Amino acid sequence: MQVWPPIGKKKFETLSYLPPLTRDQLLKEVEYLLRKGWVPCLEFELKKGFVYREHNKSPGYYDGRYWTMWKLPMFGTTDPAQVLKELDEVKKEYPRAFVRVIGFNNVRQVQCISFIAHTPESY
Amino acid sequence: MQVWPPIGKKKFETLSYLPPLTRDQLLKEVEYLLRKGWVPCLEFELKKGFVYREHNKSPGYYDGRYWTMWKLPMFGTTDPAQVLKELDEVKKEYPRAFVRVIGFNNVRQVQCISFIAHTPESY
Amino acid sequence: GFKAGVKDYKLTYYTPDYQTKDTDILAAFRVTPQPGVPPEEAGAAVAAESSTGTWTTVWTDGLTSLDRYKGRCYEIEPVPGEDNQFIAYVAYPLDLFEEGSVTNMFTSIVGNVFGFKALRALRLEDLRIPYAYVKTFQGPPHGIQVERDKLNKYGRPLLGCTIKPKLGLSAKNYGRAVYECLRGGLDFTKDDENVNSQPFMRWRDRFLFCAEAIYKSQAETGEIKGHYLNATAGTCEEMLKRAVFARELGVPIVMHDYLTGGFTANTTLSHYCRDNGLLLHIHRAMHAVIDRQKNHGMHFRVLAKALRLSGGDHIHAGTVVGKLEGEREITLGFVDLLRDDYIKKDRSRGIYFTQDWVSLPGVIPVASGGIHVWHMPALTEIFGDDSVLQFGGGTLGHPWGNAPGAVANRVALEACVQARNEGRDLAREGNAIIREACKWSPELAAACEVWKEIKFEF
Amino acid sequence: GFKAGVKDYKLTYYTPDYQTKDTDILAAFRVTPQPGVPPEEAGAAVAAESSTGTWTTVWTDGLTSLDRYKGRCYEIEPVPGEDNQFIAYVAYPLDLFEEGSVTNMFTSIVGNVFGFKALRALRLEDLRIPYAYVKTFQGPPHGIQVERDKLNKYGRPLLGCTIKPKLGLSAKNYGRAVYECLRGGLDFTKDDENVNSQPFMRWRDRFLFCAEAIYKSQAETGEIKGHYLNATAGTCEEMLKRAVFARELGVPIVMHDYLTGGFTANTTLSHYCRDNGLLLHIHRAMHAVIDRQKNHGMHFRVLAKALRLSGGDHIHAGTVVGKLEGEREITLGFVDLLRDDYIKKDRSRGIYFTQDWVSLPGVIPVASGGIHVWHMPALTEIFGDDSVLQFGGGTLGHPWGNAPGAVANRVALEACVQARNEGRDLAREGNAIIREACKWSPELAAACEVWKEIKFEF
Amino acid sequence: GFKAGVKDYKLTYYTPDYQTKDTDILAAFRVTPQPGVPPEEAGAAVAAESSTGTWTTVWTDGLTSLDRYKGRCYEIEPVPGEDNQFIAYVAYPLDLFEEGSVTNMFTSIVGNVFGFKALRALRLEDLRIPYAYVKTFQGPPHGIQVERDKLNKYGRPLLGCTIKPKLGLSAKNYGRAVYECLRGGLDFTKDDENVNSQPFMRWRDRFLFCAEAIYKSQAETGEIKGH
Amino acid sequence: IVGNVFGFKALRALRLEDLRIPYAYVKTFQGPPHGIQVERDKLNKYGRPLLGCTIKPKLGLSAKNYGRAVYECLRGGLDFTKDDENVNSQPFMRWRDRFLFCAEAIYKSQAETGEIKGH
Amino acid sequence: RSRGIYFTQDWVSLPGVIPVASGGIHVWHMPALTEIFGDDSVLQFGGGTLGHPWGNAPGAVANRVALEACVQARNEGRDLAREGNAIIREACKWSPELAAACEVWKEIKFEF
Amino acid sequence: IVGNVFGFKALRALRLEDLRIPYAYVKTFQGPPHGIQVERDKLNKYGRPLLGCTIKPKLGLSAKNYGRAVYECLRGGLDFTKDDENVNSQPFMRWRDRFLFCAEAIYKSQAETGEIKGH
Numbered sequence A, B: 001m002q003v004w005p006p007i008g009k010k011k012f013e014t015l016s017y018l019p020p021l022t023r024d025q026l027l028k029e030v031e032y033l034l035r036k037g038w039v040p041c042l043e044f045e046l047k048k049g050f051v052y053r054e055h056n057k058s059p060g061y062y063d064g065r066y067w068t069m070w071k072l073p074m075f076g077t078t079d080p081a082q083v084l085k086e087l088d089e090v091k092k093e094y095p096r097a098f099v100r101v102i103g104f105n106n107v108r109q110v111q112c113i114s115f116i117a118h119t120p121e122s123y
Numbered sequence C, D: 001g002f003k004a005g006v007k008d009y010k011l012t013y014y015t016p017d018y019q020t021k022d023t024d025i026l027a028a029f030r031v032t033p034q035p036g037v038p039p040e041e042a043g044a045a046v047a048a049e050s051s052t053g054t055w056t057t058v059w060t061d062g063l064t065s066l067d068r069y070k071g072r073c074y075e076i077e078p079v080p081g082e083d084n085q086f087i088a089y090v091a092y093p094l095d096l097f098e099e100g101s102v103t104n105m106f107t108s109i110v111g112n113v114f115g116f117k118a119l120r121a122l123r124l125e126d127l128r129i130p131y132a133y134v135k136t137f138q139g140p141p142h143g144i145q146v147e148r149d150k151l152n153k154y155g156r157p158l159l160g161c162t163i164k165p166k167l168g169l170s171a172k173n174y175g176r177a178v179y180e181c182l183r184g185g186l187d188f189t190k191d192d193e194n195v196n197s198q199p200f201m202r203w204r205d206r207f208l209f210c211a212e213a214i215y216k217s218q219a220e221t222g223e224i225k226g227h228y229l230n231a232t233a234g235t236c237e238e239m240l241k242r243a244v245f246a247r248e249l250g251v252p253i254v255m256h257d258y259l260t261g262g263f264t265a266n267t268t269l270s271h272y273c274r275d276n277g278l279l280l281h282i283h284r285a286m287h288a289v290i291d292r293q294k295n296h297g298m299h300f301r302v303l304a305k306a307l308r309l310s311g312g313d314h315i316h317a318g319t320v321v322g323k324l325e326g327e328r329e330i331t332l333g334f335v336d337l338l339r340d341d342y343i344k345k346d347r348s349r350g351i352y353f354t355q356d357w358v359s360l361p362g363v364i365p366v367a368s369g370g371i372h373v374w375h376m377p378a379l380t381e382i383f384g385d386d387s388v389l390q391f392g393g394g395t396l397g398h399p400w401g402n403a404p405g406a407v408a409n410r411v412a413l414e415a416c417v418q419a420r421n422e423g424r425d426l427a428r429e430g431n432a433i434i435r436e437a438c439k440w441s442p443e444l445a446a447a448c449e450v451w452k453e454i455k456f457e458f
Numbered sequence E: 001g002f003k004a005g006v007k008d009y010k011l012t013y014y015t016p017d018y019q020t021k022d023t024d025i026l027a028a029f030r031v032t033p034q035p036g037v038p039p040e041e042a043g044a045a046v047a048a049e050s051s052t053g054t055w056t057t058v059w060t061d062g063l064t065s066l067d068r069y070k071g072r073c074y075e076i077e078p079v080p081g082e083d084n085q086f087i088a089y090v091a092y093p094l095d096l097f098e099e100g101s102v103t104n105m106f107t108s109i110v111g112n113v114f115g116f117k118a119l120r121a122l123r124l125e126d127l128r129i130p131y132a133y134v135k136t137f138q139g140p141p142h143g144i145q146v147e148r149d150k151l152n153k154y155g156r157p158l159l160g161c162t163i164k165p166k167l168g169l170s171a172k173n174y175g176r177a178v179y180e181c182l183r184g185g186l187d188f189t190k191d192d193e194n195v196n197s198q199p200f201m202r203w204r205d206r207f208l209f210c211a212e213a214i215y216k217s218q219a220e221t222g223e224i225k226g227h
Numbered sequence F, H: 001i002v003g004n005v006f007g008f009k010a011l012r013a014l015r016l017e018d019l020r021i022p023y024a025y026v027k028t029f030q031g032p033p034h035g036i037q038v039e040r041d042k043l044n045k046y047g048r049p050l051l052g053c054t055i056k057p058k059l060g061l062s063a064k065n066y067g068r069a070v071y072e073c074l075r076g077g078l079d080f081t082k083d084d085e086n087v088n089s090q091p092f093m094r095w096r097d098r099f100l101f102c103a104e105a106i107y108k109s110q111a112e113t114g115e116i117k118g119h
Numbered sequence G: 001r002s003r004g005i006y007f008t009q010d011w012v013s014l015p016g017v018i019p020v021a022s023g024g025i026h027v028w029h030m031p032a033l034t035e036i037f038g039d040d041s042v043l044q045f046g047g048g049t050l051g052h053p054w055g056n057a058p059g060a061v062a063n064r065v066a067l068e069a070c071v072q073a074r075n076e077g078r079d080l081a082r083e084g085n086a087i088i089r090e091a092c093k094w095s096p097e098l099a100a101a102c103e104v105w106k107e108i109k110f111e112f
């Protein structure tokens, strides 16, 4: 009978319950995004890495929901190579920082995948 | 005329004003609990082993009241032994947790007893 | 066919052959009739005047169904002496009563009948609340289980202290006493019955200094803290003004004396407390006026059923070993009536009727009345964990003050619980359990010397 | 110097030399103490526990002034007969009590001191309300003055009739019955005290059918008509829902049972009554539970003053003659207190203090209870003109019915008035003014044959 | 002691020995089970899923009292045919239900159970509303007696006419029909079910032309009129 | 459309398979308070099915056990917990209580995991 | 009509409802599920969670992982209905939470 | 303008005689609710002064007797009667009572004179 930890087990939404994603896997998700027709976009956070409510608290109002945007979403892009390329560069300048890969569907106008790409060291 | 200290007197509900009980007494509380047909379960906490109020403040509302569940209430336990076994166990996984031994009534469906069974060390 | 004039009561309202229905409210009157007045008649007299009847024949009875709606007297029981006292058993149908309304139920079974020149005297002992009637009531806004979850307090009796002097203290002086009290280990403090808002102290200033003090000590002890805030008031508007402010401070709990306020005022209050999340504390201020005598009145037990359906989290229940009266066996009876879901006919404790509450929440009995540290195994044996025990003087008469008075009480309470839990007999070892727990507690030991010979026993 | 320990009550509470301030509240308690508790000790126990003291010493006494605030037992009258019941005089300083609230004043003075284990029995005979307290009260919504001028009715006792059977009449029969009683001569009809809202007959229905009947009889006779509508309910929402509708219906009077209703709700009801011009009738349902016995409770006088203060247009006041208890001289005493601006001490009447009301409106007393057409002159002689005389049996039981029963009483009332005014003596020549009156009313004469030889005597 | 996994329904929720209580809501389901499905089980299946139970063992049952709160199936009655249809008698305690709340009572005894793949079909025939439950309800705002008093109508059945065409009439055209109707001797006229407020006719205009017409004919006939 | 035509004595059985709602009628409707779009963006949750769990037993859990149970389920990975359909307000467990103990648990699990939580 | 879709239905931008699947489902259902509803759906497990041998936190973990384990595999290009039973066994290897639940609901199939 | 200057030590006595109300400030005001022209067109009287009378004694009269004198005054030919400045609401006569008798008394002396009356 295994007791699940109540600390040290912070999560990042879709995929964070599996082992961390290898570069064959961080590639394979990127391909799917592109195979489906989404546009990929990278985002990052240096401060509070999870959700909180500082400035308001009414229903469905949350804080820490937004991160900062890495450049522009990748209209133009066909290769999954060029995405992880950006991931390399964003780590390489903000190593103490959360980075997420997202992709849009422009017809529905929602985010259709999102998954952690990088963490600090522990959080 | 003596002064009761205004700091350093943090308490834990039932029994917490008595001297810490020996295992002889700890097994004795379990025996009482089993003898009246209640059902023992162990809870514990690591961040915040007192009540505060952060996430709302209205009458009747407090945070910190729930701890984490240690496995499952011990349905079909008969021998007060078995309670201590699990108690020692949580201590080994989390020496620096707060741990409660709680006994369920199932008819009245409220906790009929609840006394602290381990503190960390420092605070 | 209608004939004008006086007839005996016994002819319509005495049916020794009647089979009570599960829908009937079942009244138990201890009747002392006049010289001459027969059982059956004064018995019938009682059921008529408390229900549908009248001192003469009236014609409109023909318009409706007497059989469907009359209170009947169905049993007379002879009672020792002469005197010629007796117990008259009365069944009133459901249909006679306003749903959810103690007020309609008491107006009727007790409106008028006690004033019959034709009795010496008359007492309502007990009332079988049929369950179909219970179900029309909210009752307590939370109940025993729910209070314990909300405060997170388990395994032991609870601890309160009404502040003193009853009257004459400032708002700021109040919550001074309240803070020094709560921090020393009391689950609750309270307003005395007497305090609402006066010249020396206007409520909202009180409510304020109490709340600053509710919490400064919660975060100090790491233990959930209340103070009974009395809403009790002149008018219903004020009474609602007081628990709103309470609702608004975040405070766990409010108080109302239900009988000098009245069951109407009380029911609105128990209705608002459930909708706003407030515990409800009840004083039975003014009871002994109604309940003290054996031959005339209303037994406390009716007054405690009636509070259960009107609604309240806590009700004072007597101290037994205290300064206020209340005998053991009789007291054990109405504590289960306040508490339990089903209560079996028990004549030796004075339960005259099997009482089913079909899931209504229980009210926690509050003990309180010139008790102190040595009465505490009597208290933890008499009530059981499921109780608030409460120490006014017994906390502000402790020699070193409020935080120590409060300590002395919490340890001695804890001591009894460890002692009990471990197999010791609280009737036969409690004096020694206290002596024991003195070596380990200097605060306790101090309050033990001042109060080493104070009993109240008549 | 805070000394811990139990001390005698007498030391701080008994003060045989106290001179009362025109502002205190004064109490006369009929104390029957236990065996071997000295007068003075029981007197001060009573005075401390209803004011500022407790059972052991508390240091929070030193933060304030006990001198300013304490209740004082200021006299002990050793009492006639009973061994050894005495009368304890206690003085409560004004500052103790909250403005506008009977409840509070009934909470300190009677909260607990009656359950006192160190006594046999306690009863509250009289309460002297200072006139500076009386002034924090609206009191009656209207008073005997406005009531009369609103209705245009002068020079006689008012007449009502309580509809029967108490319960079990459906709304439509309620109104045909009101119509009947109001048209044949009655100023008022009325719901019984138990009539509130039940399965047989829901409140709103009753109100509508009864408003119609009010206004049909009023056209019929040319006389101003008033049916009493019960707002008594489980909750003040519901009590207030009913007066609002009575408001909307435009009808002149509503009813509330104050003791069961209760005081917070009652003074809420009077406020809405003076704010929307509804006259308000009171029933004292349950009063008998508390006032009935000689040794222990509260005399009707005390609850008569409470009503004045809280508010009420009419209050029930016993019949002297009828079926429930109440005796003349005493019954005489309490009428001047509901009615007059000033009642001097008068112990022959059970009038303990002088009571000044400082222009507060008077209550019209209501006589009601096994009365009939033969009672009418005893009645007129006892209450006088400022009174409401109430006949359910007296009307709904006449051989000819409700219209006539009305006529019988209305004439037999009138027949009294004129005779008294002409210079006849109503108690010596009473039985005759009626026989002479039987000659001209066939309505009357019929009723005297049916209630020939009913006398309520015990 | 808690053991994880699927067990039969019949073991907790079929008590042919149970004595119904006056507080129990008493359900009468006409059940057509699947091939194989025994009486006792599909019977129990029914009471579990309409009350406290679940398709597997869950541990929280230990936290509360099953005996105090489970709906039981207490009687199966064989019904003519094969088919193998039957009548299964179900007792749910009081405590399961929101006071004054048809909504809670129907959600529960009829929320889900009719969708069991494990039946062919299922019908709720009748429900013993225990009186202690009735008493929590206002029910009709007046009732038979009260309506008759208010209208003053006695001794005969009452008379209504729903207006036509169901839809497509004007507000003014409505109460034209309503007036010619009520004056000829009907106690009532009505709106068809279908009419509320539409393009051809907005309610409040209707309410208006009906009321002008409620009364013009009341005073004409000397008889109380509704629509 | 379904008021009476199904009780028609001149038939054996009736069933309504499909209804074509014109788009000019659809436009007199607010419809969903939020829709699949806003729901996802409010919670910050994307790229997977959402996960809930209906608390058991259907009935008979007291408010305090409701919340310890929610806390448990929400913390170990679920996006959502839930009351059963029958769970409304009853003797065993009055609504307001449930709401308060359940709000606490919502917010305790949310801190615990860093994931947005919804009971 | 193959789908029981009688008419063409236009919604003119009206928001969509997220469908909720729920009813005797468990950890083994998870990929049939993901293949049927897709991502825009809410998958609901009371039994599926409150009945795991280890309790509620784990039952949660079992489903959360077995869900995830599906997502990634579909995204990587696996077929969820032909290779469904496996993405789970491979996943039993890393979650002790999961693996426990597949032993308990090994051979429960809702079929009629 | 009249806040403190009347208290200066360096003064023995100061009186504000007049205030030029510039027209710009006038405009932020409503002023009289109806004014002369409008009163006159409501009450429908022209050509003469109006006639009034204050009810006497100042204070001390009851709600009925107020209304009894209010009728006897209007009918015999006053355009107005009126409460004295100090009549408000007191233990000798509460307001809601005056208001209500005084209104019987206004309309009755209205239907009797056929002139419009007030109080």
Ligand SMILES: O=C(COP(=O)(O)O)[C@H](O)[C@H](O)COP(=O)(O)O
Residues within 6 Å of the ligand: C162, C192, C193, C283, C284, C285, C287, C316, C317, C318, C319, C324, C366, C368, C369, C370, C371, C390, C391, C392, C393, C394, D054, D055, D112, D115
């Ligand atoms: O004020 C006191 C005495 O305080 P203490 O004894 O703590 O100083 C009590 O709490 C109640 O008045 C007792 O009445 P009841 O029997 O109604 O509770």
Ligand SMILES: O=C(COP(=O)(O)O)[C@H](O)[C@H](O)COP(=O)(O)O
Residues within 6 Å of the ligand: C054, C055, C112, C115, D162, D192, D193, D284, D285, D316, D317, D318, D319, D324, D367, D368, D369, D370, D371, D390, D391, D392, D393, D394
């Ligand atoms: O209901 C009746 C009896 O009516 P009747 O005798 O006219 O049938 C009483 O008048 C009052 O309710 C009794 O209260 P009190 O004793 O104060 O009057």
Ligand SMILES: O=C(COP(=O)(O)O)[C@H](O)[C@H](O)COP(=O)(O)O
Residues within 6 Å of the ligand: E054, E055, E112, E115, F054, F084, F085, G021, G022, G023, G024, G025, G044, G045, G046, G047, G048
């Ligand atoms: O309560 C349950 C069963 O829970 P579990 O099987 O998870 O114990 C259901 O999920 C829905 O209420 C049934 O409705 P539908 O058939 O639409 O889902």
